[PDB]
Amino acid sequence: NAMHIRDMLAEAERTGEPSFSFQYFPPKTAQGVQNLYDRMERMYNYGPKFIDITWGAGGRVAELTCEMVVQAQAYLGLETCMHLTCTDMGVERINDALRKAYKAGCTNILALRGDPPEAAKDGFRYAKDLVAHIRKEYGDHFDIGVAGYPEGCDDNKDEDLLLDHLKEKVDMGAGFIVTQMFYDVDNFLRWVKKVRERGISVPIVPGIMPIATYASFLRRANHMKCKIPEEWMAKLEPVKNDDVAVREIGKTLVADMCRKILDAGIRHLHFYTMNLAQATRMVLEELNWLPSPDRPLKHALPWKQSLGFGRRGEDVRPIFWRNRNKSYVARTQDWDEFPNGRWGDSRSPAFGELDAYGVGLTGSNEQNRERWGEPKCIRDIANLFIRYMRKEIDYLPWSEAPVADEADLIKDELIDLNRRGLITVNSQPAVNGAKSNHPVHGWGPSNGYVYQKAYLEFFVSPELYPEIKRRIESHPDLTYHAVTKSGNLETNAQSDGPNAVTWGVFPGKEIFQPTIVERISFLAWKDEAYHLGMEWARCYDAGSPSRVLLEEMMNTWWLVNIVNNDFHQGNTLFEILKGLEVTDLDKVPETQ
Amino acid sequence: NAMHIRDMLAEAERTGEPSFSFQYFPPKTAQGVQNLYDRMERMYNYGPKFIDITWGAGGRVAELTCEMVVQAQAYLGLETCMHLTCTDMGVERINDALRKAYKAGCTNILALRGDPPRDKEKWEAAKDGFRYAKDLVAHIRKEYGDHFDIGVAGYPEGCDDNKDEDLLLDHLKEKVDMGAGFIVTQMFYDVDNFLRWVKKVRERGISVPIVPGIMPIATYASFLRRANHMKCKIPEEWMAKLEPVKNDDVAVREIGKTLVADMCRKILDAGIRHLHFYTMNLAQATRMVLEELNWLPSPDRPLKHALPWKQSLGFGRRGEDVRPIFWRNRNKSYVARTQDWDEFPNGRWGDSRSPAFGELDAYGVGLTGSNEQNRERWGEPKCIRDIANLFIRYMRKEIDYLPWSEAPVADEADLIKDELIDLNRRGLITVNSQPAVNGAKSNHPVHGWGPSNGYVYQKAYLEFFVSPELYPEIKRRIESHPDLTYHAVTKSGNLETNAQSDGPNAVTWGVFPGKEIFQPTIVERISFLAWKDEAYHLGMEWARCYDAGSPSRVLLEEMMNTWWLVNIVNNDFHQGNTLFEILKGLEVTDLDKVPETQ
Amino acid sequence: WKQSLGFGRRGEDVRPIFWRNRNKSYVARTQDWDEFPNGRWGDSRSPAFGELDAYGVGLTGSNEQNRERWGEPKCIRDIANLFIRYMRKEIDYLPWSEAPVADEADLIKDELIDLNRRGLITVNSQPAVNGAKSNHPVHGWGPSNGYVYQKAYLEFFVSPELYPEIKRRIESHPDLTYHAVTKSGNLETNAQSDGPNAVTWGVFPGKEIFQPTIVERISFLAWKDEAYHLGMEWARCYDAGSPSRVLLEEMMNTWWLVNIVNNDFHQGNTLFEILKGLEVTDLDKVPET
Amino acid sequence: MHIRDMLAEAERTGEPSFSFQYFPPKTAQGVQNLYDRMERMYNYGPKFIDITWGAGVAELTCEMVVQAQAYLGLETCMHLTCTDMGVERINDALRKAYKAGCTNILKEKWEAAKDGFRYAKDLVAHIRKEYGDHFDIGVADEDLLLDHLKEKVDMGAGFIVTQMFYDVDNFLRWVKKVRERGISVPIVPGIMPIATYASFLRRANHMKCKIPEEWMAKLEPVKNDDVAVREIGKTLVADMCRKILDAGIRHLHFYTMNLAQATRMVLEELNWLPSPDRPLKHALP
Numbered sequence A: 001n002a003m004h005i006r007d008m009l010a011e012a013e014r015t016g017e018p019s020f021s022f023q024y025f026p027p028k029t030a031q032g033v034q035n036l037y038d039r040m041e042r043m044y045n046y047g048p049k050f051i052d053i054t055w056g057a058g059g060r061v062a063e064l065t066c067e068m069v070v071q072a073q074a075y076l077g078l079e080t081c082m083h084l085t086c087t088d089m090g091v092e093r094i095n096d097a098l099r100k101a102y103k104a105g106c107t108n109i110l111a112l113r114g115d116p117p118e119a120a121k122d123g124f125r126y127a128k129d130l131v132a133h134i135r136k137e138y139g140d141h142f143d144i145g146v147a148g149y150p151e152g153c154d155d156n157k158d159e160d161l162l163l164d165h166l167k168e169k170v171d172m173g174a175g176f177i178v179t180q181m182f183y184d185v186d187n188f189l190r191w192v193k194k195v196r197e198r199g200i201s202v203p204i205v206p207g208i209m210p211i212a213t214y215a216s217f218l219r220r221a222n223h224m225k226c227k228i229p230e231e232w233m234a235k236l237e238p239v240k241n242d243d244v245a246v247r248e249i250g251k252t253l254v255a256d257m258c259r260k261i262l263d264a265g266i267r268h269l270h271f272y273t274m275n276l277a278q279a280t281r282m283v284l285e286e287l288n289w290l291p292s293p294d295r296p297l298k299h300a301l302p303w304k305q306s307l308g309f310g311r312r313g314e315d316v317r318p319i320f321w322r323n324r325n326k327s328y329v330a331r332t333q334d335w336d337e338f339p340n341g342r343w344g345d346s347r348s349p350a351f352g353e354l355d356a357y358g359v360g361l362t363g364s365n366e367q368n369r370e371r372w373g374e375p376k377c378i379r380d381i382a383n384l385f386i387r388y389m390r391k392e393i394d395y396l397p398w399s400e401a402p403v404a405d406e407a408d409l410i411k412d413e414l415i416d417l418n419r420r421g422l423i424t425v426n427s428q429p430a431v432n433g434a435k436s437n438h439p440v441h442g443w444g445p446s447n448g449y450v451y452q453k454a455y456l457e458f459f460v461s462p463e464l465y466p467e468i469k470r471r472i473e474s475h476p477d478l479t480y481h482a483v484t485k486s487g488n489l490e491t492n493a494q495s496d497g498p499n500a501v502t503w504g505v506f507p508g509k510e511i512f513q514p515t516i517v518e519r520i521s522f523l524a525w526k527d528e529a530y531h532l533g534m535e536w537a538r539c540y541d542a543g544s545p546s547r548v549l550l551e552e553m554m555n556t557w558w559l560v561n562i563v564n565n566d567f568h569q570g571n572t573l574f575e576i577l578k579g580l581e582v583t584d585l586d587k588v589p590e591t592q
Numbered sequence B: 001n002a003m004h005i006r007d008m009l010a011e012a013e014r015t016g017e018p019s020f021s022f023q024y025f026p027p028k029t030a031q032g033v034q035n036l037y038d039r040m041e042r043m044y045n046y047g048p049k050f051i052d053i054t055w056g057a058g059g060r061v062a063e064l065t066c067e068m069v070v071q072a073q074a075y076l077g078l079e080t081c082m083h084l085t086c087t088d089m090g091v092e093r094i095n096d097a098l099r100k101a102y103k104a105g106c107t108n109i110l111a112l113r114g115d116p117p118r119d120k121e122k123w124e125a126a127k128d129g130f131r132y133a134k135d136l137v138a139h140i141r142k143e144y145g146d147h148f149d150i151g152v153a154g155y156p157e158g159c160d161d162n163k164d165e166d167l168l169l170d171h172l173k174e175k176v177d178m179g180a181g182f183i184v185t186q187m188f189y190d191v192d193n194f195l196r197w198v199k200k201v202r203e204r205g206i207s208v209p210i211v212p213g214i215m216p217i218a219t220y221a222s223f224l225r226r227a228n229h230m231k232c233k234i235p236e237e238w239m240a241k242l243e244p245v246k247n248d249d250v251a252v253r254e255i256g257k258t259l260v261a262d263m264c265r266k267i268l269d270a271g272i273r274h275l276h277f278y279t280m281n282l283a284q285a286t287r288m289v290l291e292e293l294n295w296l297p298s299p300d301r302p303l304k305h306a307l308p309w310k311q312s313l314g315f316g317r318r319g320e321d322v323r324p325i326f327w328r329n330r331n332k333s334y335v336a337r338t339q340d341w342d343e344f345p346n347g348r349w350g351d352s353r354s355p356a357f358g359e360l361d362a363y364g365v366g367l368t369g370s371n372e373q374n375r376e377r378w379g380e381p382k383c384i385r386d387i388a389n390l391f392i393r394y395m396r397k398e399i400d401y402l403p404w405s406e407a408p409v410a411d412e413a414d415l416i417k418d419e420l421i422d423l424n425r426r427g428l429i430t431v432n433s434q435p436a437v438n439g440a441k442s443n444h445p446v447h448g449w450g451p452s453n454g455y456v457y458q459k460a461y462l463e464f465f466v467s468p469e470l471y472p473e474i475k476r477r478i479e480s481h482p483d484l485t486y487h488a489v490t491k492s493g494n495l496e497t498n499a500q501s502d503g504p505n506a507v508t509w510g511v512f513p514g515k516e517i518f519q520p521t522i523v524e525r526i527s528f529l530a531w532k533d534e535a536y537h538l539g540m541e542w543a544r545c546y547d548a549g550s551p552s553r554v555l556l557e558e559m560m561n562t563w564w565l566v567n568i569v570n571n572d573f574h575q576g577n578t579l580f581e582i583l584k585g586l587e588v589t590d591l592d593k594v595p596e597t598q
Numbered sequence C: 001w002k003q004s005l006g007f008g009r010r011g012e013d014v015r016p017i018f019w020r021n022r023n024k025s026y027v028a029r030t031q032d033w034d035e036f037p038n039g040r041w042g043d044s045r046s047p048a049f050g051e052l053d054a055y056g057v058g059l060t061g062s063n064e065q066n067r068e069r070w071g072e073p074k075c076i077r078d079i080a081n082l083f084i085r086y087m088r089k090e091i092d093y094l095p096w097s098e099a100p101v102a103d104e105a106d107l108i109k110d111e112l113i114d115l116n117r118r119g120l121i122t123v124n125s126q127p128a129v130n131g132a133k134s135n136h137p138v139h140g141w142g143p144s145n146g147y148v149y150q151k152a153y154l155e156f157f158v159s160p161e162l163y164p165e166i167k168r169r170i171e172s173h174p175d176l177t178y179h180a181v182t183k184s185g186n187l188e189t190n191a192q193s194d195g196p197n198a199v200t201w202g203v204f205p206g207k208e209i210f211q212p213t214i215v216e217r218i219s220f221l222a223w224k225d226e227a228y229h230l231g232m233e234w235a236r237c238y239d240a241g242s243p244s245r246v247l248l249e250e251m252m253n254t255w256w257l258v259n260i261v262n263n264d265f266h267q268g269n270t271l272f273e274i275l276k277g278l279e280v281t282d283l284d285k286v287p288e289t
Numbered sequence D: 001m002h003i004r005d006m007l008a009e010a011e012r013t014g015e016p017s018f019s020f021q022y023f024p025p026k027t028a029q030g031v032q033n034l035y036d037r038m039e040r041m042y043n044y045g046p047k048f049i050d051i052t053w054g055a056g057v058a059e060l061t062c063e064m065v066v067q068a069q070a071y072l073g074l075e076t077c078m079h080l081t082c083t084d085m086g087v088e089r090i091n092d093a094l095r096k097a098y099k100a101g102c103t104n105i106l107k108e109k110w111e112a113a114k115d116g117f118r119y120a121k122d123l124v125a126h127i128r129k130e131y132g133d134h135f136d137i138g139v140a141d142e143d144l145l146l147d148h149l150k151e152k153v154d155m156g157a158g159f160i161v162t163q164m165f166y167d168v169d170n171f172l173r174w175v176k177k178v179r180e181r182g183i184s185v186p187i188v189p190g191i192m193p194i195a196t197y198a199s200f201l202r203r204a205n206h207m208k209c210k211i212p213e214e215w216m217a218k219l220e221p222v223k224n225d226d227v228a229v230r231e232i233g234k235t236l237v238a239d240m241c242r243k244i245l246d247a248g249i250r251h252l253h254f255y256t257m258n259l260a261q262a263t264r265m266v267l268e269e270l271n272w273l274p275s276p277d278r279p280l281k282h283a284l285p
């Protein structure tokens, strides 16, 4: 997708595909901020083209907004459009705001004059002045959008002069117009022609606000002075108290409005989420715009691609942060060059420090003990992993998210490894040329073919480790690396250099190879992997059976990764480990 | 592949595989030099690990040797070991010789004291030169560090002047201790003596790999003459077996095949795994022994290739592992054209890459041999059908050269042989192609390349000249298949294509253990535009073989000026033949038409 | 080495070479051991060395004093100089030695100086000995009328730029075994086993073979962390952001630590010879702040 | 030390790896002669030896294993059948071999001896269950046979030892057909060298071996002279061995028949016997 919203809107108008965006606002509680980041990350899977973040007048609002943009671009991987006003705004403040968004990796701004908390600190008078300011300062780095008013401005009710000012703001170098919320559709599509009539050619983006409650609906609508159709009123009237009935009615009311906007050729829909998923989600489902099995969400790469500052070109990573994306981003953030096309032999990557980068466990200890309980022996840990694999619990220390569907192939093999005490932290099955549109294995351009080498990574008792090493060396197709917290590194590798474990053949294109395995990267990963297990131990009280068990485990157990270079036969790897078991699975440590 | 001979010898001793080398010498005629370059290039296909080039006294000899090393490393793609003596050699002379070998891409030297000149009985050291070869080994080591792996001479039957076994092995210890990686021995015919000597070397704490000097038998005269000159012990059983057919050198060669090979078998049994053959600039004597050892490549043990094309070992081309498909059959040409490149492409071609590609004339990417000879090969075509015939003959191995190929018809072609023959008989004159491969084991006798226990893949490729009359219909048909991408071009300049970008399209790639994806062969626009000019130029140089105003000359010049050159990639590698099928039924008009001069 | 008389150590008679010059340290780290090694180290032995940060023994005296001793190094050549000064008995302490320069070093003094002046900063070593009388003033130890032997050992920091060339050279000698490691974690070696390699041993009359000094992987991994920590504690003597501080912290984070055993004890200096010609780049470079 | 590992390292290095099969003699004299012959053949340097198991003989076999492991210093593989064998007989046999220091095991009708086993697959599984992985276990209508071979192997056998053959082409074909069926374990060919013309033909015909007409034709003229037959059958058998070895199969198991010379001559013909030049290696003084 093109970084500039004007290009996205244009190709949306061309293909006719489902194209939509989500507007969010900065909450006051830092808690509400975390909830919003979680909600953002869930709504990500609906598949928006971009998101907006609104800009309030106050000082901490200005800072929070800038922090939120960074979060969204770098970690959540969401193309953001930061709003920016001239309300209480010195030019120093504006240049700061813009520099922050710049360094986030942002390429989209919405240029506003701004509602009051309108000349402030001798800033800019009109939004046209700020559009021209951005254009002069950053050239064509930021694509600029501007506000529009199909039902008139609240104070300003001369439609002809308004469209003249719109022409001004656009002519300063805006790429697109985003409108206020409306509920009179005929009025809107009329307005659109009147905009074009004035020689304003840019893409229009309607402001859609879906219905969540009868109260919030009517209150916000009346506050903005929206024309609500009597047919809408009459349909919502009988179940007005019941907001479940109102939400399932206003699903279809809003969606009908959207269908007529869409019919008219206007292809992008911008949803005012109000930091709420469900109201928007129900309308997107009503439009069958939400992804299905039948029309799944497309993935550029086998992993969640960042849109951070120097990360537009990043298209190769180690497998080891397959399940800790945000972490990899945090650790590699200070890289001046990201890897592209291949990892290469010369690359000596300097990964980030664990603590220094906030690469830790999620939530409170009290909560994590609630999730994971109090393990007294190795069998309890095994059980917990089996529960994760069966989707019964949703988080483990070594995974940002719940169990994959890619795992649901080899689910029972991994369960068997865990029940034997081979605690599996990471894996992928072998794939031998699945079509690039496979619902599970698919990634990258259409009409490709994707491939994977089988990978398996697990903790094992130092007693058992010798037997495992022996067995692995007795297989020619297997390569491993084994390491202890202590330092010791064993391997049967032929080289330092990276081994490709996921690759794709596409038409007209050089071979894509997004996932590798490599020694230095594994040494970076091992420290994280032991640290996570240690932070888990620190959830428990100092002398605990849980605490002593985990600390012991981490200090004394090996971490083994294994690649099966045979991608014709993948399960080879699970078979060669069958029958091995860790010695005293039920043993509780006495604390002496 | 190991660049240092010491490493090659070591891994040979480890795997146990067939490992052998060829020694050649600089000839006096520049003709003999050309013959030798041709012979070298043929013997290349036997698959040596390296070759040697000897170093005489004489100014011409010293320069020719250095030029021959460049040729061997850069163009013939043969890892060379240059000999270097202290005979008539100032230090300035030595530093020059070494710098030349350096810039060739050479990484192997044989450090010798050297036989005296043809003027001289006695060996006198040339002023500001070295006394012993130990001094030169240490010199190379000091100058170039560990860039050059150094080998030294050894004498299992004693030196010609020196018959004190004990002190000779002491000076061998000296030469080795100065930093030699391996020992190459003089020719011998007493094997028991050799394997005894080997233990006496090891006894003295000389651990380096030993490489026996094998000189196979070509004539009864040369055998006895060289052997007696060097004072070799020849077994009376060898003498007695060669005695009856001494005049008949055919019978002597088929006898001395098995005599020498039996000696080799006992050397090999003993654990010594590398054999260094003194070819005397002759293939057959060595070849017969290699066949006797079934060390020559077969279906059973096919020839290993690093990449789907002949890899250069030129200066700085060690890292070169991606090329356009278009010089699949003109390796030397691509080397010539790209020689002045600062960076060679590596791992991927990449999107921004804007390559230069040389100039045709001024680099010698032209016709091989005389016009008189090329007319002998190709005859005198009067119409387009005669050209078709010639291509079909090449495809059936009946003739060995066509303008657009350095070499005879490939085995990779022998899959799709009758498809290409059919295209030619219809007037679609095919210059270049490859079949589709969907994951053949990297040891495939036909498709195999690169490391062992890989899987290789290819997209089907087809490249041909077509009459401008027919071209429209071809274009139409190609566009009517979605998996096909093409580029079509005229000598005039005009370029048509259905490509979705400028960027390179991968057409050969390999998955190997412990390694990133190899992708050695691509297709790309700028490269194709470089190629088309060569391709038309070659057909025009063909025309220039004939007299001005010829039916042949006019025909070919016409053809080149007016015909399209079409390449086609089938992005489906599951089904390759789609592209041969799409073209079935089309034929060029006036195949038998002679262009009249009255 | 200096024998302990601690609680269960009267019978302790084998140690790794690595704490040859940090006795008190080894005692601190091994203090919680149930069984001290005796007669041989053995292959089964999995030694659990003590945690540095947990405390033990580190750098001696005040920072103010240590800066007085060692000065303020701005580049790698200044460090080289300081090591050469120690070797010539001019200064009495370096981070990696409890004491001043040994006499055993004063045999191979010029060889080690030459390594330091090339940027191969030598933290520990011993010369090869081929059957010196057990009463030798330098090499002697243990009972009278014995014969003592040593394999040559050499241990040094090297720039990661140069390390490749060193590895190449070492592998090109069959008698040499090495272990190389980074602060990062990475471990390279050409060893054929985990198990201990004997580097000092003695034949005595009426006695079994004495073998007090070994080299072994797990022990080396314990040692490397101490070795980098000592260089880091040295850096911490200087102010945060110092040229001295940045130099040393950089060095420790990015340089390799290589140990090498020459299993030929007939020819000892071969180890110092095979590293001739190597030199670290930018010896005089100051890291800019 | 487990034969499967030895066979694997042999297949890796490619070095000389070979074993000697002996049988229990009836006379205690023949036993002493055999112990002496074993001790001489020791110096040839086998990797292991086998001792066959008759109905009985059972007692003698167990005594012989102890002798071979403890005193002669020869790594032994004791054969064990289900012929006339209750489970108590089997457990006894196994306990004896255990205590020896051994770590390697291999009427009109065959009627399974009551409360014992029907098939060898049942005994492989029995050993595996009883003694875990202490003993490495070896095992002996082509389609159904290779199915049962898959069964015996899948019960936890580490290697296969074959019957004697004289058709080499057939063998190397068979090997691929075994691997075709997903039976990956190391194969060990049964080599029986020639000592007399009579014993050669008699045993070969009894086992129904295909003998090549070229072998027949070469031995025909000197059939009476067993000195000439032994120097011929040295090179006949050794040529067969060379082709097996070339094919990557690296261990050769010789049926000595309690006789040194027949085997010895073949080992010399292969220069697999030790020399001054390549002496027999000693672990300790």
Ligand SMILES: Cc1cc2nc3c(=O)[nH]c(=O)nc-3n(C[C@H](O)[C@H](O)[C@H](O)COP(=O)(O)OP(=O)(O)OC[C@H]3O[C@@H](n4cnc5c(N)ncnc54)[C@H](O)[C@@H]3O)c2cc1C
Residues within 6 Å of the ligand: A053, A054, A055, A056, A057, A083, A084, A085, A087, A111, A112, A113, A114, A115, A116, A126, A127, A128, A146, A147, A148, A153, A156, A162, A165, A166, A168, A169, A178, A179, A180, A207
């Ligand atoms: C999608 C969207 C998002 C919004 N987000 C925010 C937000 O994050 N924060 C916030 O505070 N507000 C926000 N608003 C509200 C908006 O910023 C205010 O309503 C704003 O003052 C309207 O002006 P404008 O931004 O359209 O720019 P302008 O059109 O430049 O505003 C100037 C006003 O003065 C009048 N005018 C008089 N003379 C002129 C002249 N010469 N040229 C131009 N106009 C003239 C116009 O009629 C107009 O009413 C948003 C509105 C929309 C539609």
Ligand SMILES: Cc1cc2nc3c(=O)[nH]c(=O)nc-3n(C[C@H](O)[C@H](O)[C@H](O)COP(=O)(O)OP(=O)(O)OC[C@H]3O[C@@H](n4cnc5c(N)ncnc54)[C@H](O)[C@@H]3O)c2cc1C
Residues within 6 Å of the ligand: B053, B054, B055, B056, B057, B083, B085, B087, B111, B112, B113, B114, B115, B116, B131, B132, B133, B134, B152, B153, B154, B159, B161, B162, B167, B168, B170, B171, B175, B184, B185, B186, B213
């Ligand atoms: C494979 C091969 C290729 C060759 N190619 C060429 C070639 O291309 N051109 C060419 O000119 N020569 C070549 N030679 C060598 C040449 O023909 C002579 O044999 C050479 O003069 C002597 O061998 P060297 O170079 O190894 O001498 P060195 O070992 O350096 O010195 C030779 C002299 O040192 C003497 N010596 C022996 N022991 C001692 C001692 N302890 N102290 C001092 N001196 C001692 C020898 O007796 C002899 O007189 C080649 C040899 C081989 C084996």
Ligand SMILES: Cc1cc2nc3c(=O)[nH]c(=O)nc-3n(C[C@H](O)[C@H](O)[C@H](O)COP(=O)(O)OP(=O)(O)OC[C@H]3O[C@@H](n4cnc5c(N)ncnc54)[C@H](O)[C@@H]3O)c2cc1C
Residues within 6 Å of the ligand: D051, D052, D053, D054, D055, D079, D080, D081, D083, D119, D120, D121, D122, D140, D148, D149, D151, D152, D161, D162, D163, D164, D190
């Ligand atoms: C290397 C070797 C060693 C020998 N060692 C001995 C020895 O120590 N003692 C001895 O007395 N003789 C031995 N012999 C000869 C022979 O084994 C015995 O005479 C006797 O016949 C024992 O069983 P078996 O030969 O049938 O073999 P086995 O292979 O043990 O036969 C049983 C196996 O064959 C298969 N099988 C056979 N019939 C069936 C069926 N109906 N249904 C299913 N599976 C079936 C099963 O897999 C079963 O496990 C040996 C022969 C060789 C080649």
